[PDB]
Symmetry: C2
Subunit: 410 residues, 2 copies
């Protein structure tokens, strides 16, 4: 009967993934999101990585559910007029362009919130450098600290520079809406891809300061028989926090790249872990009884657990080990996730009917609310809503026809 | 003169990283965040990974800036009474416990928003399984798709299961505050670590569907001379989207694990890339002139670029290549980030004075606002605000003294 963003109007210039992920969520929260697209071309994701000739790619449909699409040429007298009318009516304008002024917009509409995503902050030496996903992962600390100590920096499959940056801009936009309830004014909100990556790497900045102070990191694989340099090193599949763990092979790993589990050695669970793996002697042995004592031979311990896990299927391994309250889970493949019934039931993976394509899967709205449920719908066809939007703005049918004709002739 | 969450009152039961990251942001947006801690012990991060004996760890100070701390024993008659008074006054209650009912809370305070983080959704077969960071990375798709095709699943340094889950809960809480402006009611908001990871891996679900349809992924390293299985494979340092790229060695890589850059081959920038690397012949050569043509020998191309990058310092490499509008950046180490002047100027890395410790660095508020600037402050000492909070609740000095005495005796 009501949604959080009921009545909110968004002008959405975003493309690719960072900005569209943000505005897709705005739409799912009830906002009217109008994608303003280049006539005859549209968002680049419509044409990238297509699996079916001549129809919008999955890259597009999974990021643009529930949006409206207009085609608009701002470089004409009528396009500029349409743009001004849209700005007067809008609550939020969002853009994520590579490197109508804000001053003018404020004068047109002092209630408007302007959201902008860039690769880097305004004062960065890299302010004018184009960033894609992995460029941000490199600049933000993640590639440096992900991977193995004897291998290269490694990018993460997770969209640390793209969807993550979108989620951070979304936080800012919702805060700005809340602030507007108090001030009656909009404002500018900016978010950089580098900063989004850094925020998720906060704990690696913790580790850099520990390393600066002490010269070693007790819980890292390099302690005590390896070497530390001046910067936090890659730790392979180490825990990353106060509880050690590792990725362990399960039955079938020679041919199945996802036949593995993650296993945590939780400090407060040590006795239960010992019972699980048939090592009751390790409950009181001073070399094993505390985390500090375990650390210098922690890989011998993981090797002992792996002697068991390699003999059974990962799902069996987790079923057995969790009886002992061990934090662990299988490494789920994208195929397993795409078919998991619980993720359908939770609305985490959602089937959507798309015009011209038929069914596709998307990731749904991740957080759950007791007072409303988003209804996830198809993505817009290019320019599907141009006429409807112009009508809502007060243009007559003859005026709309004239605009379309002028465009066709130009 | 005003902040977005001015006057909002938060009761914060969270510990470790997911929940505290969320409520730290609430505090930075102006909310009063009261951490409710176990007497004599407090949040586990106070004592984990310490670098200085007997004072709060950096793990704690970098996640609990600007909060208040009370020590409260809910298992006594007076503790339950304090708890009820706090709930009556609060806007938001947040918890992230491992696996006062909601029904009762709604009756006490129909305006209260209750936020909860768990490892898994309520209908998951894993609902009762403990999750740490990397357990969620395994269950959410990220470990499966991160790393190399001939190596194990790999965890990301970025806190995909922890701070990322916090940011998603934060989105939900701000949406619920906006919804409350319309309904006059609070609600429950829930977020799972598995779902947070999956949301950042949306593009790998795109790829799984493409793979299901076609049997290959044209832009992955395995095309065309490798093999595809049933699930999206690890792609090493591949682009992840519509623009190919790779991590390339720079001068010093034999001894410096961060002597590398990320380099993107941007489709619309191919001629400029050719000019950059001294290969004008590749502008019109049909084997190189289009992305489709480049893909089968893309690693020969990266090898040619690396013949240049290996000869100069990464920062020199980026200075040269960006003149040609190539999207690229150095792999910045945590040491470089910790000292970068631009990140201080932008408020992305922030120096804070902590009682008993002195100066530490934290990651600041990532998004920037034109209408307010957060002031990032010290973390609370354990129980620092117990008396102040009890006074605000209307307890007399004699009552507070009696509560402290009763506790000391018990
Ligand atoms: C370059 C990245 C761009 N500024 C966003 O998206
Ligand atoms: C070091 S990778 C895995 C090896 C085995 N788990 C031992 O330790
Ligand atoms: C186990 C993870 C916990 N439910 C949160 O944090
Ligand atoms: C395959 S890892 C890097 C090797 C080199 N960039 C070629 O290609």
């Amino acid at each position: 009967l009501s949604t959080p963003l009921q009545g909110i109007k968004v002008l959405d210039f975003t493309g690719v993934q960072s900005g569209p992920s943000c505005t897709q969520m705005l739409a799912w929260f009830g906002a009217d999101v109008i994608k303003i697209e280049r006539p005859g071309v549209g968002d680049v994701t419509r044409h990238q990585l297509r699996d079916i000739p001549d129809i919008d790619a999955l890259y597009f449909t999974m990021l643009n559910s529930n949006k409206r699409s207009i085609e608009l040429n701002t470089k004409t007298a009528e396009g500029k007029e349409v743009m001004e009318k849209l700005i007067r009516e809008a609550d939020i304008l969002v853009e994520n362009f590579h490197p109508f002024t804000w001053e003018h917009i404020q004068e047109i509409n002092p209630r408007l919130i302007f959201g902008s995503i860039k690769g880097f902050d305004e004062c960065s030496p890299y302010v004018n450098v184009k960033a894609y996903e992995n460029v941000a992962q490199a600049a933000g600390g993640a590639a440096s600290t992900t991977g193995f100590w004897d291998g290269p920096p490694l990018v993460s499959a997770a969209a640390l520079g793209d969807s993550n940056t979108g989620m951070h801009l979304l936080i800012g936009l919702l805060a700005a809406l809340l602030h507007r309830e108090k001030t009656g004014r909009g404002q500018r909100v900016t978010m950089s891809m580098q900063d989004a990556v850094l925020n998720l790497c906060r704990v690696k900045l913790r580790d850099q300061q520990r390393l600066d102070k002490l010269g070693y990191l007790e819980e890292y694989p390099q302690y005590p028989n390896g070497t530390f340099g001046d910067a936090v090193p890659r730790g392979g599949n180490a825990g990353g926090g106060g509880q050690p763990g590792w990725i362990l092979k399960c039955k079938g790993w020679e041919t199945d790249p996802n036949a593995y589990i993650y296993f945590t050695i939780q400090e407060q669970n040590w006795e239960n872990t010992c019972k699980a793996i048939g090592k009751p002697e390790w409950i009181t042995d001073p070399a094993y009884s505390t985390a500090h004592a375990r650390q210098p031979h922690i890989f011998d311990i993981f090797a002992e657990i792996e002697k068991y896990t390699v003999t059974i299927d990962k799902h069996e391994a987790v079923a057995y080990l969790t009886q002992f309250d061990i934090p662990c889970a299988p490494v789920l493949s994208m195929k397993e996730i795409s078919l998991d019934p619980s993720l359908r039931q939770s609305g985490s993976v959602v089937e959507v009917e798309q015009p011209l394509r038929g069914k596709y899967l998307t990731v749904g709205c991740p957080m759950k609310f007791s007072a409303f449920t988003p209804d996830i719908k198809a993505a817009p066809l290019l320019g599907e809503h141009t006429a409807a939007v112009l009508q809502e703005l007060g243009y007559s049918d003859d005026e709309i026809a004239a605009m379309k004709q002028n465009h066709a002739i130009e």
